[PDB]
Amino acid sequence: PVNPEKLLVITVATAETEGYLRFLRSAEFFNYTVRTLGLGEEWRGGDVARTVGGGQKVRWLKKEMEKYADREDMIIMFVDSYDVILAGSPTELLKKFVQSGSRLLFSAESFCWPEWGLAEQYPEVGTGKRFLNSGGFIGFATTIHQIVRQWKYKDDDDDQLFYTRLYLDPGLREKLSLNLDHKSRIFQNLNGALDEVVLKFDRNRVRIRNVAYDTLPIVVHGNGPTKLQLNYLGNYVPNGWTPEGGCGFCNQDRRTLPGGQPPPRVFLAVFVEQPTPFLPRFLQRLLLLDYPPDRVTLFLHNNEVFHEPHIADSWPQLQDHFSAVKLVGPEEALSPGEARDMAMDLCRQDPECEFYFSLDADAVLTNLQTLRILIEENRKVIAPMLSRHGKLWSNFWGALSPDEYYARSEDYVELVQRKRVGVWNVPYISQAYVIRGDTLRMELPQRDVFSGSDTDPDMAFCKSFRDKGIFLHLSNQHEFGRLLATSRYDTEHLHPDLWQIFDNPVDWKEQYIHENYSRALEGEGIVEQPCPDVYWFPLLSEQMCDELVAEMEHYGQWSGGRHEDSRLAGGYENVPTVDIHMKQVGYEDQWLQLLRTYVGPMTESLFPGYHTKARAVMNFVVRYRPDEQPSLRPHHDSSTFTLNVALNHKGLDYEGGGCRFLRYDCVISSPRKGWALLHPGRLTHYHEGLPTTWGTRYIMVSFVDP
Amino acid sequence: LIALLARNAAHALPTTLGALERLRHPRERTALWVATDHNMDNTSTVLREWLVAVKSLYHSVEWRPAEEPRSYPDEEGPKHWSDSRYEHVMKLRQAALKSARDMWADYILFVDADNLILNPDTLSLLIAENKTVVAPMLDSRAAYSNFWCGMTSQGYYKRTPAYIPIRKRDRRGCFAVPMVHSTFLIDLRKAASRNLAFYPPHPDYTWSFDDIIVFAFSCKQAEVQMYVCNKEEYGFLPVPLRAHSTLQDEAESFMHVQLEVMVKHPPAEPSRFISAPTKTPDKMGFDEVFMINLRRRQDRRERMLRALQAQEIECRLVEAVDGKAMNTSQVEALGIQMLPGYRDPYHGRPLTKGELGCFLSHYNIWKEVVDRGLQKSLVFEDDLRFEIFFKRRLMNLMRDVEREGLDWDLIYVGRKRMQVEHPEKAVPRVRNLVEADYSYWTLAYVISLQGARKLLAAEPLSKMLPVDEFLPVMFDKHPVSEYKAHFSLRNLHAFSVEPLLIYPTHYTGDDGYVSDTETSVVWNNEHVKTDWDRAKSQKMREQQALSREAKNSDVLQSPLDSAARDEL
């Protein structure tokens, strides 16, 4: 029952990185009394763990211990600060230490880092770890003073070999009662024991467990080249994420953008280096972001000769909108890495650079408040979570393979499907991030971050950002949008976006399908029945109608007119019209897909008890002109029902009429542009189209279910 | 409710059904769901007979026979797990679970054909744990058991460092695991047990189409955890074979499970309602089979007679030459004289009496085989543990060596190799045989006529020593050259089997170790009784001491000696 007020955790941290703050939060969670040493001085050692180092910490500890050389009623714990998180309570630590009995416990690892020749001098150990590691130890004040008073070397001298040499002396070890934590009972090292640690969830806290010896450690030290595993462990242990408490430090430290002064300036950066679908929609959405236009500068980098007309058309709106706008064209022969480096150099060299919001053109930002939230989070680097539609692709990696490429992690699927919500720590983010300005200025003053290597620019950026010790956060609290699939893209078309019904269904639906279709499907009016058993609902918008008409007119070969046929197996038409069947233009499969997806469910709801597969054979577009051919004679159709969609406006471009039903004396006067006509066409509907006198009119027909 | 799924299980049904009939649970609070199909042998007849005999006691019995057809179309053999077989197993188990829910019975105990539930209190001890899914840990002849400890990426075995401590019972209590199969127990009164489904995979299922991984995914998505715990011993189960073996291999596997039961427990008695198809022993194609046993020792001979009968082997039994009781009057009648300049190689004691009696019995057996002129014979002891496919492997090896032809005399079958070093030469154009070396433990050996004649001509009457140290002298492999110099001819060509076939039942410093020899009086005098050596045993085992670069991988292996599935 040792008093928990006699513990004193003392660490060393020259600066205040994110690792030191994480350790501080973990310690203050369980009520410990930490004292940091050397907060402000310069690191007079060398490389942190490349070859040697760490001789300044012993000197600092020796200088500090002079004030505790006489106290016996205190227990002193020494731990590295940048790569350690605590997972236990002070009372449990005290109980385990008292159970150990020794006056000094070190942390036992399985490797002999500095010197290899001393391997055989260590006392033998059956199962547990054998060697000694200086990353953490606990003992009484007098014994620690006796150990540390003998340090007299150069400031760059190594540290571990001194402790090892001191411990290997039998007489000294027996005199001062040294010992090691053989079975990982308090200190756990994540180097050589990565397959013995499992997360053990609980009601409101998370703890690690050692399966090999059935012990629960108190401190976790990710020494060696296993800092990424410790970063992964830090999302949960000890109060990061809990099964009933959501996230931990994932909603605080929020600016909330007060002051009345205009919000912090942001240097927008948009990069286009591939032929991407739906680019003009992205450009027109750029103006709709919720941020004042007198603060957001812009840097648009276009790297394709194919995308010049779109940006050239949309340029005046951007030039008027934002405060300052700069374009880099394709004629500069600029590699993508050089362009990204130039953008970061531009903002970094500008003292007004307060943030930096890079944004790839292959990123649809459904949420219009993403920028405000990401500025408000106040982290060094934070990225939203965008995921492909109906897949597990995303813009982050759960874990890293030894080849430094993608390697699947354990909870990637949980994060992708938003079963867990918070601000996670990941080794790789891409396609959208918000880097702070001062981080670019006084923490990464180097210029070449993307280029200068054979590797891809994104992996190079993430590697150079991880090597400096900066965390890459990733927030998936809200819905931030989706990614577009640009793997394949046929550009040899007048309007290539029309063929995108198989790759990006959602964006295709938003752009081409009529905006009132969903309401009509759900049944709040709109759909009309002007005559018995004929329906009138909207299907296509103006963009699809115009684009289809222009694409068909580009074909030119308006066949049709002769009673005999060559496109038909029978070889004889009952009634000829000038038409362009979709098989000739290659749009047949996409049209069948549209019929299967959108027309089907509505015609099922309209006529209850009817099940459709939307299998059609004949579908075409006809042109009615007073010169070439007049309207049609009364007839029937060889189908269950027919779909009659118009493709232009009445009066503006033609002066004619629609359909006339003989069995009901029903006449349709003014068909709309994107609206579709539905009616059975086999038995009880003897229809006949009206003639046109002025201009030309377009109609799309499809004899579905023959 | 107890659910059984039987197919080609006629060999195993009596013993396991007798074991399951004696569960300490009231017979009016139990129901049956036997369901058999797709079988070759007459499992249906025996299952029907047992049902008809036992239908009265139990609450309600079900019966779903589907005799035709007798094989799946797109399968290579009875052990080929085609996708149709998987589908059928899914549907059958899901039907059993569904019929266990619409009947208002809590708990359901999924037992299969080959699992031998030995402890009568297994059901009560599993009920008294208060978990949804819990499965007892069943023993086996290898590291195989009925629980996993990790899934790699798509539902495949992975050895977690917490397996051997659990399986070898270095820890106890109930431990959460990601897989339990074979025998388990599902609670049907807890609310979370309403989402478990065997056949229909979850919509998010993307892994392979094995039948036991789909239930793990269903348990994981339904937020339940599967336990497995081994506070005491429960039963045994045989290791699965390859996907190209026959039914005879499976029968031999279950018979070896039956033998491995007896070595530390009373024999697994069969049921009463159905009987066992008693077998007719064969002579291995040998001439004789001798087994030297003491009349005073009666427990040892019964288990060995049962082992020989269960393996369909006769036994031309021979008694012994009681020696703890033989005095000098009859010792010196036959010229028995202790070897000049001999001692215990490990202690220094001159000689004991158990070795004298054992050597006398072996000498008499040798004399008999010489007199009657048997080409070959097999000699045994009282403490044996046969390996899997013992009979068939021995037949094949002996047929091979006889067909090839060479100067074999003393093919060893059980021995101990203390000479741990670089491996020994392998005889060409033969399989599973290696050249002999230094070895104690003459548990069993195949004597020949020529070898026996040479050994008798050596005339070992005036040289007394233990047989395990005798035999290495006569083929020029003993370390010390003084004893060899005391002898004249070493024309013996001994051999051995690299995949050893017979091991002793009890090692030194273990439970139940009683040795007729070693702990006795000296060959002379009557007041020096050496005790059983506790610290200076020196005969523990040559298995852990061989866990090094022993190699011996250049040998040619028979098509047998290959088994196991995802677990080892």
């Binding site: 990565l194 640690v197 499992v198 997360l199 053990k200 969830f201 609980d202 009601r203 467990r209 595993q229 992964y232 462990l233 099964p243 874990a399 390697a407 699947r408 992690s409 354990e410 | 208002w104 208060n130 978990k131 949804t132 990790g150 790699t152 990426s153 977690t160 959460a176 009164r189 807890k190 609310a191 979370a192 047990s193 937020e223 339940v224 955890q225």
Partner: peptide, 19 residues
Amino acid sequence: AYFPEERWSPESPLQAPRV
């Protein structure tokens, strides 16, 4: 793949008795 887990699955509530 790293850090295998042992999720919090608390024993489920019993079902209402049959009648």
